[PDB]
Amino acid sequence: PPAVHLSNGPGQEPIAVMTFDLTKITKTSSSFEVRTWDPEGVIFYGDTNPKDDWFMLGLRDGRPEIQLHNHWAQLTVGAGPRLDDGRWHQVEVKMEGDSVLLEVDGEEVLRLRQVSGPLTSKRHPIMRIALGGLLFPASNLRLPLVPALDGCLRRDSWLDKQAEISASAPTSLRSC
Amino acid sequence: PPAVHLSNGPGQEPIAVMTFDLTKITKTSSSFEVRTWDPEGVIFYGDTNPKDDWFMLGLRDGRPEIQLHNHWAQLTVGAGPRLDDGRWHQVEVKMEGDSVLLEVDGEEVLRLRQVSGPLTSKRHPIMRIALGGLLFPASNLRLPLVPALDGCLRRDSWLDKQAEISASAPTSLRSC
């Protein structure tokens, strides 16, 4: 299975950005496998607005961390086991009603409840997903961390491929 | 080791309430072991103000759930494995800087960051801890649940015993 490096060069920007049309979404889940020895960094970021409607899944002290900022909630939460042990880990993020669920290696490790309304029914119908980086300065995070994540990603599926509008990459993706 | 039932009668109120003087606190951690087959309910509640400075640790769908409401954050978060398997489980809740940490059976399963300033340096210097129930109607929770927790508690330590002002129990505690 083809795998890509989650950091390019200095690791100051995402390795890829995908844009989706929220009105065409019929699937909200995203899943992938990640391998790394890096204890801190951004796995993926998402927003419909970089100022007040954004989300970030990363690692801090080797463990998953989600920072989220929208009309309903603003939080910085760590959960789950360390993933920086150099082993492949299955990760899944999805919506379940008004909640965001995080599953690691088959187990639910975190459920952020009351954080969102239906996606398709959101104001701005365009969602951006960035891999290995944010779409705003790391210093503007609720809790800053250094975004560079020295790791590999494979078997990824992002939201609903049928709603994907476009995909870009500042620089060509590197294979692991 | 002596153990007590976490629910008395209809399970509409806590089995015990302890009050502490925050200025005398030198230890914030609380720990105990719990056993139960009940998937939903309140393990313990805490506040300095039932309207806008409160906290609740309970179970929903068998898993830990924390609801917290204060000047800095307002959240409803689920995390960790199910604990309603009828086996004894070690649980520890403590402050680590501005974060609230939750450990289950020796493992950190949840860290709510940026949710609080130093306790000793809080406005109202009195904190109440209630076991097996809340100090306000369940309907006023951020996300209501039925508080009755049919389970047993033992080996409990609450905050700093040297700062404990008093302890009450609506009805006499029952042994498991």
Ligand SMILES: C[C@]12CC[C@H](O)C[C@@H]1CC[C@@H]1[C@@H]2CC[C@]2(C)[C@@H](O)CC[C@@H]12
């Ligand atoms: C977590 C989700 C959904 C599951 C999907 O698998 C990944 C995306 C990333 C973007 C999140 C969105 C949930 C809703 C958010 C928090 C909006 O309020 C602002 C950014 C959005």
Ligand SMILES: C[C@]12CC[C@H](O)C[C@@H]1CC[C@@H]1[C@@H]2CC[C@]2(C)[C@@H](O)CC[C@@H]12
């Ligand atoms: C979680 C803590 C601390 C660890 C201790 O072991 C238990 C108590 C319960 C009460 C919490 C407090 C943390 C600060 C809170 C959220 C205040 O803002 C309002 C209620 C307080």
Ligand SMILES: [Ca+2]
């Ligand atoms: Ca890193």
Ligand SMILES: [Ca+2]
């Ligand atoms: Ca119950």
